[PDB]
């Protein structure tokens, strides 16, 4: 089924991204809230784009049930960024790193083409990862750096009760999407690209 094909097809790419030096250093406690704050700022930029593409694709009637508005992160992230930075100065200060320009560009292309299969791929890579590994990242931020849980809204998924059931239903929804061979292939290739973008985001943060 598609959920299994996605996981396996992308496993290599998930591994490259997951074990990048910046994320590895961040999670081990080698870095700081400032570095975590920089990541969330870059994530705000790309979640903002992702969610415009989700909106376009949901509106077209494609994969509707999967593209649960409860997953939207951009607004909670801004709120986390207001707390982390102590004001909204960040909105005028932040600039997309080169990795984020490419990532955001691809998201805007998908938005504008209203490319359902491609958007699903990006949705899987960001949201199922947030739901899967996000409590680990949040827990490390509180543990290593004393980050206040109120500045970790991005990881809380307010509005979802049983998380493992949610993930299971999300995978069933993936397995239920109607897709041509052409569309399945395009989705799978796009999932690898999504991991490729995210790894470069961390590389650029590492620099
Ligand atoms: C850009 C980096 C990055 C992305 C986009 C990412 C996404 C991601 N991680 C996942 C699972 C997972 N992710 C992790 C671990 C991590 N996940 C993390 O993001 C980090 C920092 C860790 C480090 C511990 C583990 C253990 C699983 C298995 C859980 C599952 O399959 O639901 C899944 C679901 C796999 C599936 O069920 O098909 C996705 C889409 N993981 C990443 O690392
Ligand atoms: Fe992960």
Q: How many angstroms is the resolution?
A: 1.9
The owner of tokens 């207001």 is 82
Yes or no: say if 13 and 192 are a contact pair by the CB < 8 Å rule.
Answer: yes
**Whole-angstrom distance, CA of residue 122 vs CA of residue 63:** 13
Residue 131 Cβ contacting ligand 1 at under 6 Å: no
* Pure H helices in the chain: 2-18, 21-28, 33-59, 74-85, 90-93, 98-113, 116-123, 129-145, 163-176, 181-206
The structural domains of the chain, ordered by start, are 1-207 (1.20.910.10)
The owner of tokens 């200060």 is 93
**Whole-angstrom distance, CA of residue 62 vs CA of residue 147:** 38
Question: Token pair for residue 66?
Answer: 């999967």
Tell me which of 2, 14, 187 to substitute to probe ligand 1's pocket, judged by most ligand atoms within 8 Å of the beta carbon: 14
**Whole-angstrom distance, CA of residue 102 vs CA of residue 79:** 25
Residue 141 Cβ contacting ligand 1 at under 6 Å: no
Yes or no: say if 100 and 170 are a contact pair by the CB < 8 Å rule.
Answer: no
Q: What dihedral do alpha carbons 3, 187, 137, 111 form, nearest 10°?
A: -140
Please give the radius of gyration of the chain, using alpha carbons only, rounded to the nearest integer.
16
Yes or no: say if 46 and 129 are a contact pair by the CB < 8 Å rule.
Answer: no
Buried b (16+ CB within 10 A) or exposed e, 90-106: beeebebbebbebbbeb
- How many alpha carbons fall within 13 Å on the CB side of residue 150? 5
Question: Token pair for residue 14?
Answer: 């998930």
Q: Provide the annotated active-site residues.
A: 19, 47, 125-126, 129-130, 134
Give residue 23 CA to ligand 1 midpoint distance, Å. Answer: 12
Residue 113 to residues 49, 60, 68: CA-CA distances in angstroms? 14, 11, 20
The residues near 67 (Cβ < 8 Å, ≥ 6 apart) are 54, 57, 58, 123
């Amino acid at each position: 089924g598609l959920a299994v094909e996605l996981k396996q097809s992308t496993a290599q790419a998930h591994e490259k991204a997951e074990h990048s030096t910046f994320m590895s250093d961040l999670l081990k406690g080698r870095l700081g809230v400032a570095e975590f704050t920089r990541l969330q700022e870059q994530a705000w930029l790309f979640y903002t784009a992702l969610e415009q593409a989700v909106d376009a694709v949901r509106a077209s009637g494609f994969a509707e049930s999967l593209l649960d508005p409860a997953l939207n992160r951009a607004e909670v992230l801004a709120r986390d960024l207001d707390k982390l930075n102590g004001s909204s100065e960040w909105r005028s200060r932040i600039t997309a790193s080169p990795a984020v320009i490419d990532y955001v560009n691809r998201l805007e292309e998908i938005r504008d083409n209203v490319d359902g299969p491609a958007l699903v791929a990006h949705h899987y890579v960001r949201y199922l990862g947030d739901l899967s590994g996000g409590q680990v990242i949040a827990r490390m931020m509180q543990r290593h750096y004393g980050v206040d849980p109120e500045a970790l809204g991005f990881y809380h998924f307010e509005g979802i009760a049983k998380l493992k059931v949610y993930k299971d239903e999300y995978r069933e929804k993936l397995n239920n999407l109607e897709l041509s061979d052409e569309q399945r292939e395009h989705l799978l290739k796009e999932a690898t690209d999504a991991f490729v973008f995210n790894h470069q985001v961390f590389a650029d943060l590492g620099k």
